[PDB]
Design an enzyme around this catalytic site. Sequence first.
Site, PDB file in Angstrom:
ATOM      1  CG  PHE A  68     130.391  21.386  49.004  1.00  0.00           C
ATOM      2  CD1 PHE A  68     131.775  21.430  48.963  1.00  0.00           C
ATOM      3  CD2 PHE A  68     129.779  20.752  50.073  1.00  0.00           C
ATOM      4  CE1 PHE A  68     132.531  20.865  49.973  1.00  0.00           C
ATOM      5  CE2 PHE A  68     130.530  20.186  51.085  1.00  0.00           C
ATOM      6  CZ  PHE A  68     131.907  20.243  51.035  1.00  0.00           C
ATOM      7  CG  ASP A  69     128.392  23.106  53.989  1.00  0.00           C
ATOM      8  OD1 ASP A  69     128.635  24.165  54.598  1.00  0.00           O
ATOM      9  OD2 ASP A  69     127.918  22.126  54.597  1.00  0.00           O
TER      10      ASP A  69
ATOM     11  CB  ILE B 284     132.916  12.490  57.206  1.00  0.00           C
ATOM     12  CG1 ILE B 284     131.820  13.365  56.599  1.00  0.00           C
ATOM     13  CG2 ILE B 284     133.141  11.260  56.342  1.00  0.00           C
ATOM     14  CD1 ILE B 284     132.266  14.133  55.377  1.00  0.00           C
TER      15      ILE B 284
ATOM     16  CE1 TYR C 297     130.338  23.578  58.237  1.00  0.00           C
ATOM     17  CE2 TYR C 297     130.935  22.641  56.120  1.00  0.00           C
ATOM     18  CZ  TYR C 297     129.979  22.953  57.066  1.00  0.00           C
ATOM     19  OH  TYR C 297     128.657  22.642  56.851  1.00  0.00           O
TER      20      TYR C 297
END
Lengths: 400, 107, 247
Positions: free
Chosen positions: B36-37, B56, B26
């Site tokens: 962000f990641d 999540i 991902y």
Amino acid sequence: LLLQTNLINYVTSIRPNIFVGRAEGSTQYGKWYFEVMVDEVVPFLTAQATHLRVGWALTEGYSPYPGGGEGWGGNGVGDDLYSYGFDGLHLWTGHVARPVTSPGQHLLAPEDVVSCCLDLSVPSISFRINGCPVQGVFEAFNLDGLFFPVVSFSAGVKVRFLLGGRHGEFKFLPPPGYAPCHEAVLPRERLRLEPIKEYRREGPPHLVGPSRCLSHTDFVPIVLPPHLERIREKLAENIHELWALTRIHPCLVNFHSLPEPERNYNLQMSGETLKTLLALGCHVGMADEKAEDNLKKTKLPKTYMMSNGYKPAPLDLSHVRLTPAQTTLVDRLAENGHNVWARDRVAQGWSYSAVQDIPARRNPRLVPYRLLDEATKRSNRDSLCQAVRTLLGYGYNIEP
Amino acid sequence: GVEIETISPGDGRTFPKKGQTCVVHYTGMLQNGKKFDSSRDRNKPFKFRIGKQEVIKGFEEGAAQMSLGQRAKLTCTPDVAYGATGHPGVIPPNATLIFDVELLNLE
Amino acid sequence: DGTVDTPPCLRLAHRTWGSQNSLVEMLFLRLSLPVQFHQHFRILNTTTYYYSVRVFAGQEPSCVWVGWVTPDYHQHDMNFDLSKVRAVTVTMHSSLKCSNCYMVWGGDFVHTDLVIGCLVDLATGLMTFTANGKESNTFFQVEPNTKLFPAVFVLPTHQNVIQFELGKQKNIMPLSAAMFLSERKNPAPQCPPRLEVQMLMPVSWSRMPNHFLQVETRRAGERLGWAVQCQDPLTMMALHIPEENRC
């Protein structure tokens, strides 16, 4: 509030030498098509995704720079509104992501052909992937500058260009009203892929400065007194005789024996030439009017005479001379004649093409004098010099 | 459910079942474009299984809809993904999450 | 500094006028702090922000262009006109227009002072312009996620060309509330030092990369057309300023 650093992928762009633009004096069909073939591509060579976008770009606005630029990074054809592109799923313009529905909904993959179309007359950019039409169509863009094919290939991708049928076979038939881009090849140099606004080139380290470009303006290709009208008629007869001699048909006759349509055409051409010379503001050449036939015609010998037996009686080569200062005037007159001929052809719908498509209203020589071919420019200069020499042989000498 | 825009087609023959470890790559990023990641730069594929609730719920649902050898963009409303404040210092409160998940292989 | 009856104002004036052949070419000027549009697209909770410019006497409206500029603006042409504005329209199902800039020409708009104002609502997504308390029919719809900057480009025909006026309207929150996250709830306009004017320098120094991408092109064949192929993994570190979109 602070700054963020992350590893981005270097991007570069390539473009063929062909230029397509729209203007009042347009010499193109106004609608061109190219095909893009994509070879095997690694989906993720690095952390960042491969950046592959195809579309048109402006000649003076889209100036990609390796490294910094608009957005986060990886500037391409969609990073700025000066250019437009299509990555497979989203139509990008000015670094804004807008998804476009597609029949396949697949990204740029190998064994696929990308087809795009643009209309210069009416703003409309349409592209299709593997022949499947795309609902998203670019529209309402101003026509200033020149639109050229361009691909923002990534680091690990390999792509194939199909500008026209002559360069390569088309995967899909061009849509009606759209012509292959191979007909828009500039006559000065062959169509080769070159970087856009590149300041560095390989050196067997070869630093490169700014690259000269031609705008859309560059893409666009008096009174006769009776005393000068007599000289114009004499020059018309001389030009008709010279044309008959060169073509060596009823036209192959003497200056006074020329056919009536040929005589009328010669008179019109001489009148146009005299008007162009008068518009140049040269010196008054109304001297030695009676010395028009001073030169001795060489058509008397059988060798110079045509096969039909008629003697054109042209001007003597030795007697006819051209002033060294009139070379610039002759070149200007030839350029004006080429420009007015191109304008007349455009009025009939003729446009520049790689081939001579007379039924399709295409003029292979519909180019300005600066962009004209070497052979055409040489022929125009020779014709202007011959006209100047004929005028000098009739006693008409001007300083220009 | 979360929206899934298929960037690259997949075979779809096999699907991640419950209790089976799943391998993803991902490259999630925010709406504004600031990433962000991502797991690709770390060169370490992420391993998780459906039903463990470690990831999540939106990510688990997307993986359930996800297919082997398929690349798609997955966006999450802030309600399902880090409702109100969540993961301070990385994810701002009440912020959406857009992920680019891809199956290299199954268990 | 803002007075009781005067909002916090920034004034731009020509240091030299008519002396030593002072340049009168049109200048491109942009503000420092932009306004961030809300990602979602649905009296203190108003989402509209208004700023005004007081055009002093001696400046022709025909050479006045005030509005909002996309941070992707790279035009430094002396012949500036509304018709010569780069813009495209995307049509899918949907139809939207995106442009590098959104002004209205002062000459067509109007010794009186032309108080040009611009009203932008982040939630609504529509921009309106009001001059001297009179509304205008010129409306532009920007994308939901945008970072437009305040825009004013004038040609100096007077000692004082144009001056800023950052003041709250009757019911519209000041632009400083939208510019600054901390002062979002504060209705009092302020002029902090970060809110400085910026002009468009024609050329700026940029470092040339040491290693470039290796690209090789050749003619694949008579039927395969031109072919290019590059196989070199090159990566670069990017420094991006959140205030102004740049790399």
